[PDB]
Design a protein around this ligand. Structure first.
Ligand SMILES: [Zn+2]
Lengths: 249, 48, 134, 73
RNA sequence: AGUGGAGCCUGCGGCUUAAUUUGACUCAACACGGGAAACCUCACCCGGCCCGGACACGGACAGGAUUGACAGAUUGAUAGCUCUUUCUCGAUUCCGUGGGUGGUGGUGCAUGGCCGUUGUUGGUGGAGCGAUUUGUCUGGUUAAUUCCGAUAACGAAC
C-alpha cells in the first residue's frame, strides 16, 4: 500500500546515500515486527557502504542480540566477503561498520567470526582484516574465551591460526578448559604429515610467551615432543627456550 | 572435553558455554506523514 | 702570523679546566677565503607521473615557489630536476626531472650563503687549574 | 636505502569538545517524604516494551521518551 | 578531390589561472582515457566539520564508562559529529603519557598454485688445433634454406 512506495523511495535514497540525515522510516526499522519484508524492499545488496555503516549503527544500537546476529550473518558479512574478494581491501565505511558491529560482541562472534570460520572458504586477507578488527576492539573475557574454545574445537584452516593468535594477544585471564582445548588442538597437530606454515608456529609461539605459567608438566613435555616431531629451523628453538624457562603457578 | 585437566590452583569463574554452542501502527503512519511532509518541504514553491 | 705555527684549540670545560679538543697548524692568512653555509630543503613528491611530479612540503606559499624557481633540484636517488610551476596556494609545485622518480624518493634543494666569523677576540685567557680526570 | 628526515611541526590538538558530566542523576527522579513514601516527579512511559522503568525528558512544553522517541504536548 | 589562405569547432605546444587534471612528440605523437565531463563521471583548486591503530604506563568508570536520540538556536552544510530539553543504553570502556614499538601499509627478491598431454637453429656425419665451415647450392623457378636437380652430406624442430 502506502508503506510499500515509501520504502521504495527510501530504497532509492539508500542506493545513493553519502552523508546527512536519513529518513525516519529507516531508523524505526528495528522497532517494527515484519522487518524482513521491508528490509528486502530496501534491497540491502544495492546499498552504499556509508548507508550500510549507518544501518549497522542503527541495528547494533537497538538491543535484541538475536536480530543483530541475523543482520550480521545475512547482510553485513556477505558484503564484507564480497568487498575483500574484489577490491582486495576493506572500505573505510565498512571497516567502521564492523567496528560498530563489535559494539555488540555476542552477536558479532556468533554472527561474523564463527560463520566465516565454518564457511571454510575464508582467505588470508579476510583473516588479517577481521583479526585486526578484533585487535582494535576491547573484548569481554567470557566472549573471547568462548570464541577461542569454538575456534580451537573446529577443523583446521590456515586462516584460523591468525584469529587464534590475535585472540591470544589480548592477554586476558584464560579459563582452564580453553587452555585444555588449545593444548589438545596442538597435540592433534602431532601426527600430521602436512607441512605447517610459519603462522601456526607463531600461534604456538604466542601461546608459549603468554601462557607458559599456567601449563602442567605433562602437557609441557607433550609440547616439547610436538616441537621435536614438527620442527622449524627458526621458531622451534625459541619455543623450546620459552618452555624451558617457565615456572608454574 | 579433554582428559588433561587443570589439576589444582583455584577456580575463579565457572564460565557460561551453553549460550554459544546451544544457540544454533500509529507511530508507523506518523513517521510516514513526517516523511511526506519532509519530501514536500524540499521545494516549497508557495510561501513568500 | 707567518707560517709555520703550531695551533692548539682548547675548550673551557668547568671549574677553570682546559680540555684539549683540536690540534693542528696554521694555513695561509687571507680574508678572501669564501666560507659557504649550505641549507638543504626537502620535499615529498606525492603525485608521480612520467618524468615530472607534484611535490609538497618544500614550501608553503605560492610565491616561495616563484622565488626559488631558478634553483635546480636534486634527489637522494640521483635524479636532477627543475621547478616548472606552482599549482596550489600552498607550496605544491610541478617539477620536471631527467628520469622517473620512485615512490620512496625525496626531492631536495641546496641553498648557499657566505658566512663570516664573529669578532669575539680578546687576548686575555684565564689561568688554568691543574688537569685531572673525571 | 636513503632514509627521511621526519619533519616534526607542532600542531596543538589537545582542545577537543566533550559533553558535560552529569553527576548523580538518579536523585531528581524520586522525592521521598520523611515517612518513606515515594513520589515520582517524572512521567512514566506507557509504551509496548519500556514501561514502568523509563522516565520522560521534561521539555519546556512537553515530554519526550528516551528509548522509543514518544512525543507529547 | 582537396588541405595549407578566411569564419567556426576541436587536438597538441605555448600563454593565462587558485585550478585551467592527466600518459604519448615525424607511422605505433595528432576527436586513443567509448573522454559529447553542468552533481557523479575528476585525476585539479578554494574553504569547513570528523577521527587516525594495537601494547605498556598513569587517570576516570558500577556514586554509570560509553552508545542511541524528538523539537528549536548556529555557522557556507535539516551538524544529537555543540548548546535548551539530558531521557535512555550496564561495560561492548575513553582521557592523557609515550616509545625502531608500529600495519587493512609501499616496494623488491626467492619459490610456487589453477587448467591437459606423453626466417631461426639443432642431431648425427665430413673439414680445421681453433674461431669457423658443410647442410643453408652452379643453373632454372618461387614471396621464401620453396620446388626440379646437382651434391660430404643425411635427416629434422619452430
Ligand atoms: Zn526513545
Amino acid at each position: 500500500p502506502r508503506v510499500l512506495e515509501v520504502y521504495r523511495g527510501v530504497r532509492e535514497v539508500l542506493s545513493k546515500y553519502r552523508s546527512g540525515k536519513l529518513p525516519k522510516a529507516f531508523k524505526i526499522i528495528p522497532a517494527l515486527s515484519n522487518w524482513e519484508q521491508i528490509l528486502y524492499v530496501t534491497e540491502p545488496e544495492a546499498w552504499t557502504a556509508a548507508a550500510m555503516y549507518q544501518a549497522t549503527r542503527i541495528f547494533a544500537s537497538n538491543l535484541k542480540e538475536r536480530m543483530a546476529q541475523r543482520f550480521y550473518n545475512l547482510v553485513l558479512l556477505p558484503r564484507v566477503r564480497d568487498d575483500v574478494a574484489e577490491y582486495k581491501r576493506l572500505n573505510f565505511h565498512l571497516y567502521m561498520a564492523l567496528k560498530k558491529a563489535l559494539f555488540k560482541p555476542g552477536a558479532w562472534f556468533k554472527g561474523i567470526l564463527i560463520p566465516l570460520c565454518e564457511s571454510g572458504t575464508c582467505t588470508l586477507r579476510e583473516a588479517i582484516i577481521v583479526g585486526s578488527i578484533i585487535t582494535k576492539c576491547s573484548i569481554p573475557v567470557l566472549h573471547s574465551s568462548a570464541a577461542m574454545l569454538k575456534i580451537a574445537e573446529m577443523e583446521y584452516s590456515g586462516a584460523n591460526s591468525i584469529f587464534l593468535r590475535l585472540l591470544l594477544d589480548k592477554k586476558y585471564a584464560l579459563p582452564y578448559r580453553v587452555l585444555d582445548a588449545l593444548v589438545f588442538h596442538f597435540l592433534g597437530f602431532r601426527t600430521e604429515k602436512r607441512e605447517l606454515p610459519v603462522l601456526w608456529h607463531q600461534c604456538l609461539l604466542t601461546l608459549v610467551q603468554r601462557y607458559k605459567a599456567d601449563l602442567a608438566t605433562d602437557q609441557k613435555e607433550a609440547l616439547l615432543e610436538l616441537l621435536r616431531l614438527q620442527p622449524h629451523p627458526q621458531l622451534s628453538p625459541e619455543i623450546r627456550r620459552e618452555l624451558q624457562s617457565a615456572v608454574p603457578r | 572435553s579433554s582428559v588433561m585437566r587443570r589439576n589444582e590452583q583455584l577456580t575463579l569463574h565457572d564460565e557460561r558455554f551453553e549460550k554459544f554452542y546451544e544457540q544454533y501502527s500509529n507511530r508507523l503512519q506518523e513517521v510516514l506523514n513526517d516523511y511526506y511532509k519532509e519530501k514536500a518541504e524540499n521545494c516549497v514553491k508557495l510561501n513568500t | 702570523t707567518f707560517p709555520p705555527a703550531s695551533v692548539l684549540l682548547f675548550k673551557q670545560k668547568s671549574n677553570g679546566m682546559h680540555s684539549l679538543i683540536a690540534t693542528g697548524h696554521l694555513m695561509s692568512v687571507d680574508p678572501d677565503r669564501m666560507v659557504i653555509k649550505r641549507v638543504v630543503l626537502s620535499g615529498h613528491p606525492f603525485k608521480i607521473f612520467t618524468k615530472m611530479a607534484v611535490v609538497r612540503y618544500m614550501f608553503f606559499n605560492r610565491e616561495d615557489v616563484l622565488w626559488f624557481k631558478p634553483v635546480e633540484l636534486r634527489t637522494k636517488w640521483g635524479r636532477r630536476g627543475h621547478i616548472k610551476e606552482p599549482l596550489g596556494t600552498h607550496g605544491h609545485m610541478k617539477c620536471s626531472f631527467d628520469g622517473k622518480l620512485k615512490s620512496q624518493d625525496t626531492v631536495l634543494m641546496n641553498l648557499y650563503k657566505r658566512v663570516f666569523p664573529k669578532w669575539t677576540y680578546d687576548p686575555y685567557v684565564p689561568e688554568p687549574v691543574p688537569w685531572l680526570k673525571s | 636505502a636513503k632514509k627521511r628526515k621526519k619533519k616534526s611541526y607542532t600542531t596543538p590538538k589537545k582542545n577537543k569538545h566533550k559533553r558535560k558530566k552529569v553527576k548523580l542523576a538518579v536523585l531528581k527522579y524520586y522525592k521521598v517524604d520523611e515517612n518513606g513514601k515515594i513520589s515520582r516527579l517524572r512521567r512514566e512511559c506507557p509504551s509496548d516494551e519500556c514501561g514502568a522503568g523509563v522516565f520522560m525528558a521534561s521539555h519546556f512544553d512537553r515530554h519526550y521518551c528516551g528509548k522509543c522517541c514518544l512525543t507529547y504536548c
